[PDB]
Amino acid sequence: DDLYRQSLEIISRYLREQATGSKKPLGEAGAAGRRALETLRRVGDGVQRNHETAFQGMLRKLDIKNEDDVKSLSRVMIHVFSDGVTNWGRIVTLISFGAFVAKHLKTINQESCIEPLAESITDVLVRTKRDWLVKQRGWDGFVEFFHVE
Numbered sequence: 520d521d522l523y524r525q526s527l528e529i530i531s532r533y534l535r536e537q538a539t540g541s542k543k544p545l546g547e548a549g550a551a552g553r554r555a556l557e558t559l560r561r562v563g564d565g566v567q568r569n570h571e572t573a574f575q576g577m578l579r580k581l582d583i584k585n586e587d588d589v590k591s592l593s594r595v596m597i598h599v600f601s602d603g604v605t606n607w608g609r610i611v612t613l614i615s616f617g618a619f620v621a622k623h624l625k626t627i628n629q630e631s632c633i634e635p636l637a638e639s640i641t642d643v644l645v646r647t648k649r650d651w652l653v654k655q656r657g658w659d660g661f662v663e664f665f666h667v668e
């Protein structure tokens with residue numbers, strides 16, 4: 520599953536970068552996936568600030584403390600797409616919520632849960648929106664969508 524592995528590499532690098540504050544080559548996505556990661560930082564940081572009250576509100580109701588709680592986040596995550604809407608905006612909102620959870624996990628000393636978090640975000644994304652992701656040419660479509668001239 521190449522789409523899974525490539526999506527996981529980008530999502531996982533972004534969530535740990537966000538959690539630690541430390542930003543080397545993407546062995547699978549290459550110079551292109553570097554552009555995907557750079558695009559994720561720029562648009563994902565704008566999304567996080569914009570939905571901060573909503574993210575804080577979600578985190579409060581969830582009470583995420585350990586890996587078990589993190590694995591139960593999958594039931595919540597599918598609802599980023601449950602209104603029948605699929606677009607890159609929604610996809611970045613899901614990843615930014617992951618980066619928001621990843622920072623919280625690093626704060627409460629649960630850094631080990633960041634990788635299973637990246638995996639459950641990638642699983643929800645790739646297993647439920649595979650056809651749409653393939654129609655959009657995966658991360659190529661994402662880079663093109665948010666491209667600034």
Ligand SMILES: CNC(=O)C[C@@H](Cc1ccc(Cl)c(Cl)c1)NC(=O)CN1C(=O)[C@@H](NC(=O)C[C@@H](N)Cc2ccc(Br)cc2)CCc2ccccc21
Nearest residue numbers: 570573574577594595596597598599600601602612613616
């Ligand atoms: C079991 N259901 C839930 O836990 C409800 C969750 C769903 C959810 C939203 C986003 C993500 Cl990143 C995930 Cl991981 C799960 N939402 C909320 O807690 C509050 N929240 C909402 O209410 C949003 N609207 C929705 O959630 C209705 C969805 N069915 C479809 C949908 C999803 C995302 C957007 Br943006 C717009 C529409 C509007 C405002 C907002 C901005 C950012 C984050 C959350 C919200």
Ligand code: NA
Nearest residue numbers: 586631632635
């Ligand atoms: Na484990």
